[PDB]
Amino acid sequence: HWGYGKHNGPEHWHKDFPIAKGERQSPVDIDTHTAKYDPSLKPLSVSYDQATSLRILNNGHAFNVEFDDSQDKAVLKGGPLDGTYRLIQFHFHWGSLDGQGSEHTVDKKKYAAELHLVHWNTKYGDFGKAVQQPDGLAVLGIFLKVGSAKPGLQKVVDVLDSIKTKGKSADFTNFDPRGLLPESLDYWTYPGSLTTPPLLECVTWIVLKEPISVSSEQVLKFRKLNFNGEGEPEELMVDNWRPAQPLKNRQIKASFK
Ligand SMILES: CCC[C@H](C(=O)Nc1ccc(S(N)(=O)=O)cc1)C(C)(C)C
Numbered sequence: 188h189w190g191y192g193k194h195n196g197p198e199h200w201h202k203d204f205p206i207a208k209g210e211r212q213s214p215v216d217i218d219t220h221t222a223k224y225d226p227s228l229k230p231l232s233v234s235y236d237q238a239t240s241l242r243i244l245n246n247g248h249a250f251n252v253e254f255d256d257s258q259d260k261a262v263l264k265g266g267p268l269d270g271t272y273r274l275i276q277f278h279f280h281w282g283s284l285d286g287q288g289s290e291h292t293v294d295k296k297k298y299a300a301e302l303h304l305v306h307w308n309t310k311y312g313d314f315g316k317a318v319q320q321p322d323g324l325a326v327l328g329i330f331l332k333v334g335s336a337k338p339g340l341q342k343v344v345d346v347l348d349s350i351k352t353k354g355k356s357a358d359f360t361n362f363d364p365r366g367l368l369p370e371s372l373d374y375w376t377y378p379g380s381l382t383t384p385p386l387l388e389c390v391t392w393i394v395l396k397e398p399i400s401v402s403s404e405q406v407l408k409f410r411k412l413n414f415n416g417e418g419e420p421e422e423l424m425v426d427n428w429r430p431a432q433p434l435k436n437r438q439i440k441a442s443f444k
């Protein structure tokens with residue numbers, strides 16, 4: 188099965204998921220000098236006041252904080268998007284070292300981690316239908332650098348001991364994802380894909396320009412998670428990121444000058 192090791196990692200994925208070599212794969216490097224300001228892009232609208240978190244799950248590749256997406260409670264609209272996209276889960280990718288871990292890069296710079304807030308287009312009725320459409324998902328990507336702690340992340344950090352291994356879940360209600368956002372909503376946007384198998388080309392990527400800062404202790408706790416299940420040999424969940432893929436016939440647009 189796919190993963191992030193030498194024998195089942197990103198270089199291998201194309202054998203089971205040929206779309207790995209497709210025309211709109213993610214992540215990509217964001218060359219800031221080549222991205223074009225698009226004055227017709229609208230401001231993002233992030234409406235998370237009614238968010239209802241439910242559960243946190245270690246799925247063997249990352250951990251997902253899941254939300255009630257059966258009503259318009261936490262939605263993303265505006266920016267490059269037409270219509271309403273519902274928040275279904277967020278998760279992170281991170282490194283074994285502070286100098287790596289992000290999936291997107293910015294002028295080839297790697298951040299310590301990257302947060303993905305995953306949303307799906309309500310016109311397709313459910314998430315499984317949405318992933319089969321070219322405009323099915325909108326993922327808000329936010330870079331993490333190591334410095335000061337992010338207070339709004341701490342409730343996530345503190346439950347991680349309870350979901351150490353693959354297949355473990357824990358109740359995770361009343362979490363407010365607004366506490367994970369930077370001050371600015373300036374962004375880059377481009378059409379791409381899921382960054383793990385099945386690598387479906389269904390994502391409008393919206394990557395914020397401003398990173399959040401998290402503490403060394405916070406990212407260290409991410410690195411104590413396990414890819415393996417309980418009672419299996421311990422493999423630390425680190426370096427669960429896919430490297431930058433060729434941009435091909437795409438232009439990255441910026442919401443800002
Ligand atoms: C068909 C999809 C399967 C489901 C899924 O949501 N996968 C997924 C993969 C990558 C990203 S990312 N890194 O934001 O691009 C977001 C979601 C699954 C396996 C149930 C979690």
Ligand SMILES: [Zn+2]
Nearest residue numbers: 278280303382
């Ligand atoms: Zn992701």
